[PDB]
Structure formats: structure tokens, C-alpha cells
């Protein structure tokens, strides 16, 4: 019933870094 | 689009929301002459003739103007972008001083003029990016290393432990304990080299007494490093040596708990209620935790310390150096978020003070 709420239950169902587009880092560490 | 931006004392991470990982990884610096300034790689490609200024320190932002040329190094030479076209999200401390995320927020609008923003605690981001909401993480990068238990999105503050010792620590022993052997670490350089014998061939040991006593009896923990002109030279029980710090803050002449006590002891601060659920979500992150080994020793020692019936599950994920990040990337791309930014309009009416109201 709160906005936090969904927010929490969309971080746990989120799939992870797995959703993310595959994108190239410049690391320069 | 939004933007990421996690800044460490280290480490700046940015990228765009959305992404896997962050575009850009390039040192938190800002370097004098011994033009103007150099700001984060040029710096460090120029580290024999400038000194360099770290504005974060244990990671709070300490030097604001330096901040600035950070901030705007990663806006328009790292990511280029304009900022007035991209809300950006930014990553704090925990119990980052209340004046300091206001002027974070103030610069952000004010300076840079984004449409929106926000500022999110870096071990909760962590978390997130372990599809976890509740749980306990430890955050270990360049300067700082802490404990934050965290339920259903909130840390907890009461309970935040820690350790003010971290990998530039770890380096710096490392160096000191390599010389001892009969090397030579002097230069910025060689400082350099320490840091990537460090990255690359650093554990921690299951047991510290066992592990001292296979080195000294065979060569069979030695290891080879090539350095950069080409010699060759042995690595031995300094490879965990230099990370049993961690566990034993003393080796560098600090009485602070190591990460175990403090993860215990941050623990044992929360509500008995839901501390089975901070043993068993024990999530590590930065990259001060990469170390192979580090997992298995945690839950033996931590076991050592709790319960005999409780479950004790450390997580470790692969990509922890950038969880940080992640978690940003994660949250800033969420359907969900889109009410949570702090918008320029909202900066208008309220000030710098609205991130009190709407980051927390
Ligand atoms: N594979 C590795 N093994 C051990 N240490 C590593 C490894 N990779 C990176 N590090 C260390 O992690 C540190 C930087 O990590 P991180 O980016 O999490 O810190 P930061 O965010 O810059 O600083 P802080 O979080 O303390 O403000 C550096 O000291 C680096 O040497
Ligand atoms: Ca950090
Ligand atoms: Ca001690």
C-alpha cells in the first residue's frame, strides 16, 4: 500500500546486475 | 537517462542507469604542480611532477572545490554528457554529516544544474544490487571499511560499526613488509607496483598460524611477480600477511575489532527480532573484500562468534569492486523510482534541506 513497498519488491525482482545492458568500462583503477 | 555516480576516497565509478557497470573508473584525485589542475587519470599519468589532493577522506567529501572539478570531470571528459540533461543519482557514506549531502545537493543543482537527483547510502546500494533488501553488509574500498545492517531499505544507524583502515592501508603494509624482505618500494611508481602485487596475488588465510607455517617450511605459497621492466621477483607469506590485517588491525598499530568483531558486533546493536536474518544475508562489497578466501574465513570466525544453531551465509558476489555502482544503476532504472528523485522544482521551493526529507 506504500510506494516503499513496491520500490522493495521491485529491487528483490529485479533480476540483478543480469537485466543490465552489457556495456565496456574504461577502468582506469 | 539517469546518471551514477558513486564517489569513494579512491575511486570515482560512473556510468548511465540501466548499464551493467559503470563507463568510467579513474582515481578520486586532483593534482597541483610540485596548466592548473589535473583531475582524476591525467593526474595519476602525471604522479612524478604534482601533488595530489584526495577530496574524500574516509569516505566523506572533505575539500568541496576539488569535489567540484571531480564532479565536473566526470560530466563532461568521462561521460559526456551535459548534467542539465541527465538526473543523477550520487552515492554517500554512511552517516554522512547532514551539512554535507545539502551541499551536495546544493552544488548539484545550483553549479551543474540537473533536473533531478538523489543520494543514496553506498552499502544499501550494495544490497540492492543482491537482489536483497534486508540484510547486513560490509563495505571495505580505499579509506574507510564499515558494518551497516539494513532492514527493508533503511539502515540502521545504532548499529553501524567502523574500522577506519582499508586497502590504501593494506597497501601501504604490504610496501612496508615487502622491504623488510629486501625490496625496494620507494617511489611513486614502485607504490604503483605494491598496489598491483596486492590486487593480484593477496589472500586471506583460513588459519594465520597454519598458513605462517607452511611458508616457512616449502615454497609451495611463493609466487611469481614480473615487474614492469621485467624482473622477476618471489612473493611469499606477505601474500596474506598484508590482508590478515583486516582480521587483526593491530599488524599496522590500530586496537580497533577486526571486520569479524565489528560485523558481530553491529549485529549483536539490532533488535534480537531480526538478526537471524543479518546473519544468513551477510553481503560483502567494495574492493577491499576481493580478496580470494575472505568469504571462508568470515563465516569461520563469525561462526566462532554466534550461535551454535544459528545459519551463518556470507555472499561474496563477483562483482562486488562495482556493487556500489550497480545497486545505483539497478534503482535509478526502476519504474518505481521515478516519484523518489529530488526535482529542481522541488530544490526551488524547500532548498537544500529537501534531501533530508526525500533521501533517507
Ligand atoms: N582484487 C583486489 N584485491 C584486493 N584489493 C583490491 C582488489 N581490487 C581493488 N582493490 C582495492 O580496493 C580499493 C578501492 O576499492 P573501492 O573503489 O571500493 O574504494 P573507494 O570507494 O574508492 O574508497 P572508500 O569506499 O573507502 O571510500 C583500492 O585500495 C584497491 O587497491
Ligand atoms: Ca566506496
Ligand atoms: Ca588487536
Not at chain 2, 316 to 327: D, F, L, Q
Amino acid at each position: 500500500p506504500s510506494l516503499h513497498d513496491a520500490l522493495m519488491e521491485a529491487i528483490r525482482s529485479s533480476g540483478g546486475r543480469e537485466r543490465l545492458r552489457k556495456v565496456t568500462t574504461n577502468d582506469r583503477s | 537517462t539517469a546518471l551514477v555516480c558513486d564517489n569513494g576516497s579512491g575511486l570515482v565509478k560512473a556510468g548511465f542507469a540501466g548499464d551493467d557497470a559503470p563507463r568510467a573508473v579513474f582515481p578520486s584525485i586532483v593534482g597541483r604542480p610540485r596548466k592548473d589542475s589535473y583531475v582524476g587519470d591525467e593526474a595519476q599519468s602525471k604522479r612524478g611532477i604534482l601533488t595530489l589532493k584526495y577530496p574524500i577522506e574516509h569516505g566523506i567529501i572533505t575539500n568541496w572545490d576539488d569535489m567540484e572539478k571531480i564532479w565536473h570531470h566526470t560530466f563532461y571528459n568521462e561521460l559526456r554528457v551535459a548534467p542539465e540533461e541527465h538526473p543523477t543519482l550520487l552515492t554517500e557514506a554512511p552517516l554522512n554529516p547532514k551539512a554535507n549531502r545539502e551541499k551536495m545537493t546544493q552544488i548539484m543543482f545550483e553549479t551543474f544544474n540537473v533536473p533531478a537527483m538523489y543520494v543514496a547510502i553506498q552499502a544499501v546500494l550494495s544490497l540492492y544490487a543482491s537482489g536483497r533488501t534486508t540484510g547486513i553488509v560490509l563495505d571495505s574500498g580505499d579509506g574507510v571499511t564499515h558494518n551497516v545492517p539494513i532492514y527493508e531499505g533503511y539502515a540502521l544507524p545504532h548499529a553501524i560499526m567502523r574500522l577506519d583502515l582499508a586497502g590504501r592501508d593494506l597497501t601501504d603494509y604490504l610496501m612496508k613488509i615487502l622491504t623488510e624482505r629486501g625490496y625496494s618500494f620507494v617511489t611513486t611508481a614502485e607504490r604503483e607496483i605494491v598496489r598491483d602485487i596486492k590486487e593480484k596475488l593477496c589472500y586471506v588465510a583460513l588459519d594465520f598460524e597454519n598458513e605462517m607455517a607452511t611458508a616457512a617450511s616449502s615454497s609451495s605459497l611463493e609466487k611469481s611477480y614480473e615487474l614492469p621492466d621485467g624482473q622477476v621477483i618471489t612473493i611469499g607469506n606477505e601474500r596474506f600477511r598484508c590482508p590478515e590485517t583486516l582480521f587483526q588491525p593491530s599488524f599496522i598499530g590500530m586496537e580497533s575489532a577486526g571486520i569479524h568483531e565489528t560485523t558481530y558486533n553491529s549485529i549483536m546493536k539490532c533488535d534480537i527480532d531480526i538478526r537471524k536474518d543479518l546473519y544468513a544475508n551477510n553481503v560483502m562489497s567494495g574492493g577491499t573484500t576481493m580478496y580470494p578466501g575472505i568469504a571462508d574465513r568470515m563465516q569461520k570466525e563469525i561462526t566462532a562468534l554466534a550461535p551454535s544453531t544459528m545459519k551463518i551465509k556470507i555472499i561474496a558476489p563477483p562483482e562486488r569492486k562495482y556493487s556500489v555502482w550497480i545497486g545505483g544503476s539497478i534503482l535509478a532504472s526502476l519504474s518505481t523510482f521515478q516519484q523518489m528523485w529530488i526535482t529542481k522544482q522541488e530544490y526551488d521551493e524547500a532548498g537544500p534541506s529537501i534531501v533530508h526529507r526525500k533521501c533517507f
